[PDB]
Structure 1
Amino acid sequence: VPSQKTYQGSYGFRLGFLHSGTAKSVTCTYSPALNKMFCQLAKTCPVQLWVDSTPPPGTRVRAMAIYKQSQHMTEVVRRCPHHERCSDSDGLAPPQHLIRVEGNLRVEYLDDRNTFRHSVVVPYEPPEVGSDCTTIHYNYMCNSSCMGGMNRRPILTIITLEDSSGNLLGRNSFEVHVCACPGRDRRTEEEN
């Protein structure tokens, strides 16, 4: 089972999210109280990278899903059978992978030859001028409800920072729920 232990490490690595609120129209909204991202099928989910010091050119950013509940943690998070067999592929992403990256021509996907887990990796780039963080636009390609994929089981997204040689630099995670109305779900789940 992949580690989900938070380490900031040498570059002071942590995640941030837009302060998007819960109006009906929002595409994607993070809940600080729940450390949980609410997003829509195949839509833009911006995840921010914040660092105290600049990892060198060659550094890479990996995303992997895992089931949160301990009785499922061993099972590979993958797309439901309906969504594997869509004409929805961008040509770079394997059709079985839940997590894509949008708008990055240097994206790399991995089926682990040993554990069989899926992941998606992009080069690390520093913040643009007049920004203080690096944004990756993720896409989740199934609904939390999909019969036979996740099937309403909670997942975590693990984000790892790694150097050009595979050495781990830092790690963070957040829960994610993929739904029709992210605004609505976040407001409701918070009222507990």
Structure 2
Amino acid sequence: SPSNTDYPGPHSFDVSFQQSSTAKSATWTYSTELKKLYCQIAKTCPIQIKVMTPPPQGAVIRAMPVYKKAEHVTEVVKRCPNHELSREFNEGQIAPPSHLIRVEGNSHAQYVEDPITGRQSVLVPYEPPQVGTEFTTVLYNFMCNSSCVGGMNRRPILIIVTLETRDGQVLGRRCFEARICACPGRDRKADEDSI
């Protein structure tokens, strides 16, 4: 299984979330001290990238899901069959109906499965912020609930976003848990009460 350890690296690589409009019906929200994303299915979810020094030539940003619990860590993470086949969300998408993670607003995006591992992940060419901007924003879409039967089956997962050299050398990586449910607002308020 692939690494899931925070490694800031040569470019002080960092992922973070802009304000989580606590406005009850927020499409997604983020608990900082839980290191957890609460996102509704398919809704676009902006992620912030910051680097302390410019990265290599044609560096890239990969996003890969993986289960949290040790017992499942071995098993790939993809969309449950119901979702993989159903008409919704698939319409005319440049992404394979199996991949749980999609990037929005980037035709340079490119999805991928590893012949060997057969693990699914989406890559995007790193691109520095615009003038007077501190972050590079990447738009993500998560295509199944963390409760789809025939998929995550209510089995927690976490996203492993990593920065890499055009040829796969790991320049940095960060990780957060992701529960994609119907009420991120409520499921977060509650999670913050279990303690």
CA deviation string 1:59-108 (max 9, x = no partner): 10000000000000000111111001022224311111000001100011
Shift in Å, 1:23: 2.2
Give the letter aligned to residue 42 of structure 2: A
Q: 1:128 aligns with which of 127, 130, 146?
A: 130
- Unpaired stretches in structure 2, ≥5 consecutive residues: none
Measured in 2, the distance between the counterparts of 1:153 and 1:166 equals: 29
CA deviation string 1:10-45 (max 9, x = no partner): 011011101214322211111011000000110111
Paired residues in the alignment total 192
Q: Which residue of 1 aligns with 2:106?
A: 104
Q: Out of 175-184 and 113-122, give the one that drifted further.
A: 175-184
- Unpaired stretches in structure 1, ≥5 consecutive residues: none
Q: 1:115 aligns with which of 113, 117, 133?
A: 117
Measured in 2, the distance between the counterparts of 1:68 and 1:38 equals: 15
Q: Which residue of 1 aligns with 2:86?
A: 86
Q: Out of 47-56 and 99-108, give the one that drifted further.
A: 47-56
Give the letter aligned to residue 54 of structure 2: T
Give the letter aligned to residue 187 of structure 2: D
How is 1:63-74 mapped onto 2 (pairs within 5 angstroms)?
A: 63-74=63-74
Measured in 2, the distance between the counterparts of 1:130 and 1:75 equals: 42
Q: Which residue of 2 aligns with 1:9?
A: 9
Q: 1:187 aligns with which of 175, 186, 189?
A: 189
CA deviation string 1:101-126 (max 9, x = no partner): 01100011111100110010000000
Give the letter aligned to residue 72 of structure 1: H
Tell me if the contact between 1:57 and 1:125 (Cα under 8 Å) persists in the aligned partners.
no
Q: 1:95 aligns with which of 85, 94, 97?
A: 97
Measured in 2, the distance between the counterparts of 1:160 and 1:33 equals: 21
Shift in Å, 1:186: 1.1
Measured in 2, the distance between the counterparts of 1:66 and 1:165 equals: 22
Counterpart of 1:58 in 2: which secondary structure?
coil
Q: Out of 18-27 and 80-89, give the one that drifted further.
A: 18-27
Counterpart of 2:189 in 1: which secondary structure?
helix
What TM-score results when the alignment is normalised by the length of structure 2? 0.95
Say whether 1:31 aligns with 2:31.
yes
Give the letter aligned to residue 9 of structure 1: G
Q: Which residue of 2 aligns with 1:60?
A: 60
Measured in 2, the distance between the counterparts of 1:85 and 1:146 equals: 13
Shift in Å, 1:57: 4.3
Shift in Å, 1:171: 0.6
Tell me if the contact between 1:57 and 1:124 (Cα under 8 Å) persists in the aligned partners.
no
Query: Matched residues, percent identical?
Result: 56
Shift in Å, 1:188: 1.1
Q: Which residue of 2 aligns with 1:42?
A: 42
Q: Out of 20-29 and 141-150, give the one that drifted further.
A: 20-29
Q: Which residue of 2 aligns with 1:77?
A: 77
Measured in 2, the distance between the counterparts of 1:22 and 1:145 equals: 23
